[PDB]
Amino acid sequence: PQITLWQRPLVTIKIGGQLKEALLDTGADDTVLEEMSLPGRWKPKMIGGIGGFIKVRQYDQIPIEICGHKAIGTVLVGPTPTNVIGRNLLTQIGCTLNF
Amino acid sequence: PQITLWQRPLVTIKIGGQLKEALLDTGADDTVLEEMSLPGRWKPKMIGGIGGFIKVRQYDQIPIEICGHKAIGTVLVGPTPTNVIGRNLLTQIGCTLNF
Ligand SMILES: COC(=O)N[C@H](C(=O)NN(CCC[C@@]1(O)Cc2ccc(cc2)C/C=C/CNC(=O)[C@H](C(C)C)NC1=O)Cc1ccc([C@H]2C=S=CC2)cc1)C(C)(C)C
Ligand SMILES: [Cl-]
Ligand SMILES: [Cl-]
Ligand SMILES: [Cl-]
């Protein structure tokens, strides 16, 4: 698809069999979701945003569908204000910025 | 241009007679720059991201040039950890996400 930016670029993702809404964010290195359960072991990560730093749980090699495009990669889980899909997954689904 | 997302999508902007580097951020409603002087009226605003909120000054109708493309819009100025170009200016240079 081609997504213009007059509204927030919110898309449906699927992860762990569940649909969620998430924001496609080219300004984010990483993908970070609101509290949820994921399988396996996690590692610690501190990520920085506009307001400061939060601690999140890092899960690797997680399957996630983004607008129907399949990806498998690192998902961070923590107290984010919204679900955000960052460049780690945007690259997997072949996203670019164009003007 | 077509901008890949293997790396952070940094561009040069011209604003208030200054050249600055900024991040093209489809997840940002607003454009926020580190402390700088701008002409004209402003009003205070709180903006939120990962890590919580910061207080910024909101300047309206500011001319900016981004990768050779002229636009005009609201620019927020304050203690942001990095310069971000948000959707309010990305729309004006005809920037889209594609995959
Ligand atoms: C390299 O680290 C990162 O990629 N951080 C990422 C990130 O925050 N990077 N930044 C992109 C902006 C994040 C976000 O689009 C992400 C975002 C957060 C909240 C919301 C939407 C989108 C809902 C709140 C509504 C309105 N909020 C915003 O639109 C704000 C803008 C006012 C900035 N939008 C955002 O803050 C900008 C940003 C980049 C770097 C840094 C750091 C540099 S040094 C320490 C931090 C801070 C902010 C992230 C998501 C993993 C925490
Ligand atoms: Cl990844
Ligand atoms: Cl504007
Ligand atoms: Cl358009």
CATH number, domain of B58, equals: 2.40.70.10
Q: Which residues line the pocket of ligand 1, CB cutoff 6 A?
A: A 23, 25, 27-30, 32, 47-50, 81-82, 84, 86; B 25, 27-30, 32, 47-50, 81-82, 84
In which domain, by residue range, is B87 found? 1-99
What are the residues of chain B with a beta carbon less than 8 Å away from any beta carbon of chain A? Answer: 1-6, 8-9, 23-29, 32, 47-54, 67, 69, 80-81, 84, 87, 90-91, 93-99
Number of structural domains in chain A: 1
Copy the structure tokens of residue B15.
């604003």
Could you give the strand order of the β-sheet that contains B96-98, starting from the edge strand earlier in sequence?
Answer: A2-3, B96-98, A96-98, B2-3
Give the resolution value in Å: 1.7
What does the angle CA B5 – CA B48 – CA B85 come to, to the nearest 5 degrees? 40
Q: DSSP label at B40? A: S
The 3-state secondary structure of chain A, one letter per residue: CEECCCCCCEEEEEECCEEEEEEECCCCCCCEECCCCCCCCCEEEEEEECCEEEEEEEEEEEEEEECCEEEEEEEEECCCCCCEECHHHHCCCCCEEEC
